[PDB]
Amino acid sequence: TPLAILFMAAVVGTLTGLVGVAFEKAVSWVQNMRIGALVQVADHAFLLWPLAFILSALLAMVGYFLVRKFAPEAGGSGIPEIEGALEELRPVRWWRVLPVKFIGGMGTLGAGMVLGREGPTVQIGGNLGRMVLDVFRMRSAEARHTLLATGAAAGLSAAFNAPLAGILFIIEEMRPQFRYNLISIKAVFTGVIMSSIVFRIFNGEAPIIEVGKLSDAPVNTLWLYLILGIIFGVVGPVFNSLVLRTQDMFQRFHGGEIKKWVLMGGAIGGLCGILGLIEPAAAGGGFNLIPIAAAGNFSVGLLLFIFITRVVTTLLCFSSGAPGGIFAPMLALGTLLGTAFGMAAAVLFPQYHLEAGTFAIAGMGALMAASVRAPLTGIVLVLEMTDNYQLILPMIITCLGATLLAQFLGGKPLYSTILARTLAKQDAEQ
Amino acid sequence: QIVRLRRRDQIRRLLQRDKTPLAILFMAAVVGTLTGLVGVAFEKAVSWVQNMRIGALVQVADHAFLLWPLAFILSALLAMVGYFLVRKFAPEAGGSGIPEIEGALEELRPVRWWRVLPVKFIGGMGTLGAGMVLGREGPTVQIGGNLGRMVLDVFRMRSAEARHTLLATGAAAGLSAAFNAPLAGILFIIEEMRPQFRYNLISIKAVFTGVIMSSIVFRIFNGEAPIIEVGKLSDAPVNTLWLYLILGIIFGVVGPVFNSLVLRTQDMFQRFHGGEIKKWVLMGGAIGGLCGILGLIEPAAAGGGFNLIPIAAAGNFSVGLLLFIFITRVVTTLLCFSSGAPGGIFAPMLALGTLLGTAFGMAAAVLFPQYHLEAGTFAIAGMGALMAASVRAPLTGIVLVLEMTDNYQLILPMIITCLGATLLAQFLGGKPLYSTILARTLAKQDAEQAE
Numbered sequence: 001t002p003l004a005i006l007f008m009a010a011v012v013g014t015l016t017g018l019v020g021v022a023f024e025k026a027v028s029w030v031q032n033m034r035i036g037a038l039v040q041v042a043d044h045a046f047l048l049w050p051l052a053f054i055l056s057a058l059l060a061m062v063g064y065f066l067v068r069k070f071a072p073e074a075g076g077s078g079i080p081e082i083e084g085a086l087e088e089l090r091p092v093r094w095w096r097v098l099p100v101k102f103i104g105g106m107g108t109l110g111a112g113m114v115l116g117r118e119g120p121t122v123q124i125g126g127n128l129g130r131m132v133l134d135v136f137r138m139r140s141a142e143a144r145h146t147l148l149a150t151g152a153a154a155g156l157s158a159a160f161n162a163p164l165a166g167i168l169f170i171i172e173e174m175r176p177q178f179r180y181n182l183i184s185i186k187a188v189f190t191g192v193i194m195s196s197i198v199f200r201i202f203n204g205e206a207p208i209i210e211v212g213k214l215s216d217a218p219v220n221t222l223w224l225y226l227i228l229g230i231i232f233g234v235v236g237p238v239f240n241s242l243v244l245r246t247q248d249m250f251q252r253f254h255g256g257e258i259k260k261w262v263l264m265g266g267a268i269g270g271l272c273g274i275l276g277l278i279e280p281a282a283a284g285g286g287f288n289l290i291p292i293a294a295a296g297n298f299s300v301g302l303l304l305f306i307f308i309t310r311v312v313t314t315l316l317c318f319s320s321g322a323p324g325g326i327f328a329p330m331l332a333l334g335t336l337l338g339t340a341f342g343m344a345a346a347v348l349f350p351q352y353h354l355e356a357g358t359f360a361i362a363g364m365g366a367l368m369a370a371s372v373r374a375p376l377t378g379i380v381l382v383l384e385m386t387d388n389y390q391l392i393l394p395m396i397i398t399c400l401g402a403t404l405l406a407q408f409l410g411g412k413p414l415y416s417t418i419l420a421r422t423l424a425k426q427d428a429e430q
Numbered sequence: 431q432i433v434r435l436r437r438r439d440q441i442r443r444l445l446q447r448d449k450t451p452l453a454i455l456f457m458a459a460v461v462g463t464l465t466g467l468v469g470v471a472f473e474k475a476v477s478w479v480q481n482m483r484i485g486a487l488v489q490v491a492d493h494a495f496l497l498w499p500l501a502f503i504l505s506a507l508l509a510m511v512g513y514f515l516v517r518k519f520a521p522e523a524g525g526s527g528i529p530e531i532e533g534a535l536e537e538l539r540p541v542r543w544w545r546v547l548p549v550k551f552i553g554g555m556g557t558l559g560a561g562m563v564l565g566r567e568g569p570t571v572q573i574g575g576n577l578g579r580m581v582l583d584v585f586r587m588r589s590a591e592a593r594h595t596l597l598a599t600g601a602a603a604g605l606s607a608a609f610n611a612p613l614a615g616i617l618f619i620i621e622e623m624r625p626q627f628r629y630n631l632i633s634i635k636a637v638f639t640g641v642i643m644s645s646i647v648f649r650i651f652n653g654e655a656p657i658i659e660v661g662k663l664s665d666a667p668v669n670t671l672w673l674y675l676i677l678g679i680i681f682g683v684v685g686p687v688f689n690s691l692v693l694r695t696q697d698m699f700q701r702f703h704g705g706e707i708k709k710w711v712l713m714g715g716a717i718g719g720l721c722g723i724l725g726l727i728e729p730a731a732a733g734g735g736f737n738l739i740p741i742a743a744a745g746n747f748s749v750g751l752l753l754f755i756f757i758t759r760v761v762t763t764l765l766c767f768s769s770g771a772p773g774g775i776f777a778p779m780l781a782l783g784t785l786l787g788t789a790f791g792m793a794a795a796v797l798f799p800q801y802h803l804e805a806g807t808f809a810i811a812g813m814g815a816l817m818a819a820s821v822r823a824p825l826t827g828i829v830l831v832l833e834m835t836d837n838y839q840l841i842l843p844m845i846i847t848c849l850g851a852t853l854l855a856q857f858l859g860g861k862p863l864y865s866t867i868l869a870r871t872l873a874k875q876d877a878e879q880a881e
């Protein structure tokens with residue numbers, strides 16, 4: 001039995017890596033199309049503005065459609081659903097999710113909306129686990145939860161090419177802490193390592209995000225990151241509040257009727273088509289080009305301006321209900337705000353000879369740490385992506401600080417809240 | 431009916447997930463700070479006793495006959511100081527110390543901080559300053575654990591959660607103080623106390639708060655300079671990985687074997703002194719003086735371990751020399767640890783693992799010249815695999831290395847060799863060294879109490 005699981009775990013890990021890489025290029029292409037066909041009519045504005053809006057607006061509707069029609073549970077993140085699956089409180093209908101999630105996400109993210117690939121991959125992988133589990137007629141609690149977990153782990157792993165963060169996210173956030181789930185971390189890790197291998201086979205060494213080697217963080221500077229951490233400690237809960245509000249707002253709008261939902265979906269999707277060409281920092285998955293530029297140099301206000309247009313943009317796309325993630329998007333917000341802070345810090349304290357870069361990094365994982373409450377995952381994730389270990393303290397101070405203050409301030413873990421709302425809404429409706 | 435019910439109860443456990451009482455939180459910070467201080471204090475102290483020795487030993491440098499005698503005596507006395515203080519005032523302070531902190535977290539073992547704190551400190555200061563093959567984490571983790579319980583007692587916090595959290599926070603802050611590895615410290619806890627979290631007794635935030643405080647005091651007293659500096663090792667192309675899985679297989683076998691040797695040698699020593707304070711304190715001075723000699727003749731066979739090795743081993747040596755220093759240190763760590771001296775077996779394993787990994791590298795680099803392999807990368811890959819298969823904390827091994835080494839481009843090889851060894855060793859009938867020692871320390875506990 002154990003070797004079987006171990007073996008199966010490894011299979012799910014590999015599959016998830018393939019599907020993941022697949023989705024990741026499948027999204028790039030749809031983007032390449034929309035961009036290569038938008039460069040054609042680029043001659044005159046008479047047909048540039050229209051296409052821009054139409055393409056993404058249409059690609060978005062595709063997404064919203066498939067979800068609302070075939071698989072409702074493929075909307076939004078997906079992580080909350082997988083958590084629900086592990087808790088034996090939510091189904092895993094891969095037969096309609098895998099297709100929907102993949103194609104829908106392909107539309108929505110391809111449209112240029114502000115959503116991440118992690119949400120989708122982690123759920124796809126979560127389901128792949130289940131699938132495999134069923135096409136092998138395995139029915140032990142151990143097998144069920146371990147493979148479901150491996151999928152989830154390997155998924156996030158593949159979304160950021162971050163093996164460590166992958167299991168950390170399972171250990172820290174995915175698995176129901178207060179339960180005997182019978183999940184085998186060693187097995188899950190085996191899956192995660194597989195997916196990482198696949199990732200390498202298809203993308204080589206080259207990391208996703210690429211910062212250089214930033215400066216050091218002398219002791220006499222750490223207090224600043226504490227202050228920076230508090231700022232996120234206040235914004236984190238506030239952000240979850242808005243996510244939940246805005247989510248309600250849309251319900252009142254479409255009442256949940258497909259016709260309407262899909263329509264504003266095209267609306268919201270199109271808005272990202274327009275921003276796409278006029279001030280791009282406002283749209284896009286996020287790190288796609290931002291963390292890197294933010295760790296270079298920018299204007300406090302310009303930086304602080306992008307931050308706000310991105311807050312509204314992410315809230316729209318995510319709350320709307322489209323398949324996609326709030327995770328990655330939050331890492332961008334974090335870097336933005338962290339770079340603004342640090343930008344000011346340098347000026348306000350010349351004696352330190354600071355660099356907004358360090359703060360961009362320090363804050364990269366903090367927003368997510370105050371909203372989702374995965375301090376450890378946030379920190380390690382950032383480490384693997386930016387590889388600047390000389391900033392481990394600033395990173396831990398800022399991220400932990402935000403998390404401490406986020407609870408002390410009334411905040412709740414985002415995923416835990418969204419799941420809560422779905423389990424609440426569930427028994428209620430029915 | 432049951433599902434509509436399990437939903438109620440679950441949205442509660444969720445909308446209140448990881449929420450830590452402010453008192454514990456506040457104290458975890460105090461406990462972490464305090465542990466780093468006493469932590470770095472110990473490190474300075476051990477380094478001191480070593481300078482006294484090595485310095486007042488180099489004055490009789492030109493007196494060939496007044497050298498070997500001192501090399502023996504100095505280390506012999508110092509070591510004896512350690513063994514004695516342990517055997518007489520606080521027995522639980524002998525050995526690693528982690529298996530006791532582990533027992534404390536399970537209600538199976540008392541934390542007598544009043545005698546262990548000073549005993550372990552000075553005891554470790556002696557045996558380590560002697561030159562014996564012992565790690566400094568042994569003491570620091572136990573010291574940290576004890577400091578945690580102390581604080582807890584003087585402020586009168588009796589809640590099971592405050593108790594389990596600060597004890598664990600002390601342990602983690604201690605582990606990171608020994609290697610300036612914050613993530614590793616916090617991870618050793620997560621990966622080794624799952625049950626503690628299933629019951630809501632420990633909180634990651636609390637432990638993290640404590641660990642980061644010790645990490646800061648460390649920087650305050652030691653600066654940016656890293657414990658050990660390896661270089662920027664080369665990359666590890668996809669076509670290389672299968673090798674690490676093999677190297678991982680070697681460890682999965684050595685792992686369980688080494689653990690038994692640890693236990694068995696621990697027995698030999700037992701039959702010898704039977705338990706009598708003076709037999710023990712003498713065979714301790716012998717083993718300790720023995721290290722004094724190797725100290726100047728065959729230095730690689732002694733010392734804490736990384737104190738000079740995983741850094742020279744990631745540069746250049748020959749396959750035969752490595753295997754020779756390997757087995758030498760395998761027997762040398764056994765003697766020093768199983769004897770009972772206050773000291774860690776953690777860091778010493780990091781060296782056995784690094785050496786063994788360098789050897790495999792060399793062999794591999796030759797057998798497959800097509801890969802252009804640098805032994806160094808395997809040194810790193812294996813630096814944490816032996817401990818990962820003995821202790822069974824693969825995730826800690828990996829992150830610990832990443833933290834001391836800092837060659838993230840080698841994370842795949844690292845994970846493979848470490849997780850591989852662990853899986854295998856477990857499958858092959860292996861037991862967590864600490865769990866085992868704790869189990870045996872409880873067996874011998876009764877074999878007398880109910881005798």
Ligand SMILES: CCCCCCCCCCCCCCC
Pocket residue numbers: 190193197201668669671672675846849850
């Ligand atoms: C593109 C070349 C294909 C070669 C694939 C080599 C795969 C080696 C991977 C070893 C992984 C060991 C995992 C152990 C847990």
Ligand SMILES: CCCCCCCC
Pocket residue numbers: 219220222223650
């Ligand atoms: C040299 C003592 C400075 C202390 C700075 C502490 C910042 C958290």
Ligand SMILES: [Cl-]
Pocket residue numbers: 077078079118119324325326327328
């Ligand atoms: Cl997400």
Ligand SMILES: [Cl-]
Pocket residue numbers: 526527528565567568773774775776777
């Ligand atoms: Cl130890």
